[PDB]
């Protein structure tokens, strides 16, 4: 009773149907393609790049194929601050699979400034501490000599260098930290030049602090010497994140947790493993997994219109043709002949023609499948509050494509279903026509689809009719003799 929709009718019953929409997912965040994910948990991307106290299990993360993240990472960026170009950094991470947290500027360099970083709001069980990768330059000996850090790229790949500046809340607090005002932080590379000027002003009390941290990130491309210069307020990086490899990763905003699996795709709801070509699970997939369509079901009527018959049997030992509808008793194939000879009645399929029809259906669906090859890494980008237009654009763009493909999927099977159903009907007519054209004048065309012979036909001649070698002149004389009277 598998019902399919077609262009012409709706809820048509078909003998066979192959749903080509993978609606189901296991529901567990699983390791992808052998390479485990990056189980962040409660720490935001900023928290991991800086190394909050709340998560020190990440100091050397093995290679990850995708990243997860809670929607609101409560334990990221402990010190109340901002992060300039956060979303550009996240989109960069989407295409990075492995870091190595190389030393660039160890605490040994800053022998003229006290490296002791303190923070009440970011306390470690009551003790004042700071992000591991950042060093919080303060005055030494009631003086702040001009900090002059430098680095020359050596590791042979783009290095993510992440630094920051401090906006103190009080002039007194500014001076007690840096012993001078009118402070500037200059960071220069071969292409980047940025001179931030920290400003002390009254800001709302967040986590008890008024001052903030502005954070910036940059890339040392290739032997690009970076120069940090400051007369205070600089939060130096002691840890440059060299990117080990390129790749295709993503950020999944999921609250689940990693388990043990092996799936070539992974979606925020759960993993997907199927051979089907579509899935309405969730658009934000990762890796080798099929197209997304907003539909609820795509049933391909590979079978043929399942019309039962009236079943008035046992009287004359013979059956009615295909005009009245299909035969419940045929199991050998889609199309066939019922031969009511004098040696015994019986059905018999037409193996060749039904195999041809099945090959046609299979090649049809396969060709559709091959033609569909679109974007693979359709991960979800992030946009700041002042980029709303852009975000909308993205959404609309992405949404439009889904809609188009939904159409291009739904209508397709719709047309294809009609394409198949009458095709089946066509075949039967051809079969009938073929037989009718091979039995020119030796058959009473019984008008329900049958052929009641004029000459006594043993099982051999009717077998010959089935396989297309019937010899008309052999029986022509006897058939004509029977027909005349």
């Amino acid at each position: 009773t598998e019902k399919v929709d077609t262009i012409c009718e709706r809820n048509v019953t078909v003998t066979h149907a192959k749903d080509i929409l993978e609606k189901t997912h296991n529901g567990k965040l699983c390791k992808l393609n052998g390479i485990p994910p990056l189980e962040l948990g409660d720490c935001s991307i900023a928290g991991w790049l800086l190394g909050n106290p709340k998560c020190d299990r990440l100091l050397s993360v093995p290679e990850w194929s995708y990243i997860m993240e809670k929607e609101n990472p409560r334990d990221g960026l402990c010190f109340p601050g901002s992060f300039s170009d956060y979303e550009e950094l996240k989109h960069l991470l989407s295409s990075v699979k492995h870091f190595e947290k190389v030393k660039i500027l160890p605490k040994d360099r800053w022998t003229q400034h006290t490296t002791t970083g303190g923070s009440r709001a970011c306390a470690v069980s009551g003790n004042p501490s700071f992000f591991r990768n950042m060093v919080w330059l303060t005055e030494k000996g009631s003086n702040y000599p001009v900090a002059k850090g430098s680095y020359n790229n050596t590791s042979g790949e783009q290095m993510l260098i992440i630094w920051g500046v401090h906006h103190p809340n009080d002039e007194t607090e500014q001076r007690t930290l840096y012993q001078n005002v009118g402070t500037y932080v200059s960071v220069s590379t071969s292409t980047l030049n940025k001179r931030s000027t920290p400003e002390t002003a009254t800001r709302p009390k967040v986590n008890g602090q008024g001052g903030r941290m502005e954070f910036f990130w940059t890339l040392l491309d290739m032997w690009d010497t970076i120069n940090f210069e400051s007369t205070g307020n600089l939060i130096a990086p002691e840890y440059g994140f060299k990117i080990s490899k390129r790749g295709s990763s993503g950020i999944i905003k999921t609250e689940g947790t990693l388990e043990n699996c092996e799936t070539k795709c992974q979606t925020p709801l759960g993993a997907i493993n199927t051979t089907l070509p579509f899935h309405n699970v969730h658009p934000l997939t990762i890796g080798e997994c099929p197209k997304y369509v907003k539909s609820e079901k795509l049933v391909l009527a590979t079978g043929l219109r399942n019309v039962p018959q009236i079943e008035s049997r046992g009287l004359f030992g013979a059956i009615a043709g295909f005009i009245e509808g299909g035969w419940q008793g045929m199991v050998d194939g889609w199309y066939g002949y019922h031969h009511s000879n004098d040696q015994g009645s019986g059905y018999a399929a037409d193996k060749e023609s039904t195999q041809k029809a099945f090959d046609c259906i299979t090649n049809k669906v396969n060709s559709v499948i091959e033609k569909i090859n679109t974007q693979f890494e359709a991960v979800g980008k992030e946009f700041g509050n002042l980029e709303k237009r852009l975000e909308n654009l993205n959404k609309k763009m992405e949404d439009g494509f889904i809609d188009v493909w939904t159409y291009n999927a739904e209508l397709l099977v719709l047309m294809e279903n009609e394409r198949t159903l009458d095709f089946h009907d066509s075949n039967v007519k051809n079969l009938y026509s073929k037989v009718r054209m091979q039995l020119r004048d030796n058959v009473k065309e019984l008008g329900n689809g049958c052929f009641e012979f004029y000459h006594k036909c043993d099982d051999e001649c009717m077998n010959s009719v089935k396989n297309g070698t019937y010899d008309y002149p052999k029986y022509e004389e006897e058939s004509k003799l029977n027909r005349n009277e």
Epitope: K18, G303, A348
Partner: antibody, heavy 122, light 108 residues
Framework: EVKLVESGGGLVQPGGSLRLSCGTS????????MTWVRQPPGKALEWLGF??????????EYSASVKGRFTISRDNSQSIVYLQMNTLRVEDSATYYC?????????????WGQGTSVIVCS | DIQMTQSPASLSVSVGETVTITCRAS??????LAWYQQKQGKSPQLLVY???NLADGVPSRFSGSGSGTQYSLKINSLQSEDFGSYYC?????????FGGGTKLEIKA
């Protein structure tokens, strides 16, 4: 172009148990007449049993020799079919093939995996 | 359960003409049959289904015939690659038992 993979076999003590599995790659229009067959190293190829799809119940048709010994069933959620070896004997030693007719109807056991050998030496 | 055997059992012959391998039957398997080539060291292939129809890869050197409880395959032009086990299998009776199989090689 569906590749039937399979795994599970190896060296087993007589009377043990084993988890044979064959799984399917590629897009199959139907996996209805899933079938397990075996060939002893003596080259007397012998058919074992069935398993079918949703449409007509996950029914089975075992060989008379293996009516109750092996048990075929599928865990459809990941498109794989398991065969359980119980009450093993010396005769069970054979390379086991996963096989499957392409059509909705049985016309040819025309998709065969690489086979996994199982060896019960006395 | 039905009786199905290769009457011309495993043999050895040169190349280049017809070789006939025949399959019996105890009861009326109408024409549903399959002919499998099995190269030693490789998974069995498919040659003829329904006892007369050729597989997807048509060798143009195999053919089938028969009906009722009597079937046969003929290789009109044997060649070196055609050496291997050959099987007939019926799909009518619920036990899909196989044939005895025939080996094909050359007389040294």
């Amino acid at each position: 172009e569906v590749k039937l993979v399979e795994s599970g076999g190896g060296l087993v003590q007589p009377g043990g148990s084993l988890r044979l599995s064959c799984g399917t790659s590629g897009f199959t229009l139907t996996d209805d007449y899933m079938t397990w067959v075996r060939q002893p190293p003596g080259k007397a190829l012998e058919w074992l049993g069935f398993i079918r799809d949703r449409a007509n119940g996950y029914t089975t048709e075992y060989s008379a020799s293996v009516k109750g010994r092996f048990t075929i069933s599928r865990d459809n959620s990941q498109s794989i079919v398991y065969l359980q070896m119980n009450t093993l004997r010396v005769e069970d030693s054979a390379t086991y093939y996963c096989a499957r007719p392409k059509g909705y109807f049985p016309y040819a056991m025309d998709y065969w995996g690489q086979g996994t050998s199982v060896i019960v030496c006395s | 359960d039905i009786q199905m055997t290769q009457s011309p059992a495993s043999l050895s012959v040169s190349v280049g003409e017809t070789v006939t391998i025949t399959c019996r039957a105890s009861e009326n398997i109408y024409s549903n049959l399959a002919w499998y080539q099995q190269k030693q060291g490789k998974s069995p292939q498919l040659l003829v289904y329904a006892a007369t129809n050729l597989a997807d890869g048509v060798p143009s050197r195999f053919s089938g015939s028969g009906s009722g409880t009597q079937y046969s395959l003929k290789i009109n032009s044997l060649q070196s690659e055609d050496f291997g086990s050959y099987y007939c299998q019926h799909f009518w009776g619920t036990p899909w038992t196989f044939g005895g199989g025939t080996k094909l090689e050359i007389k040294a």
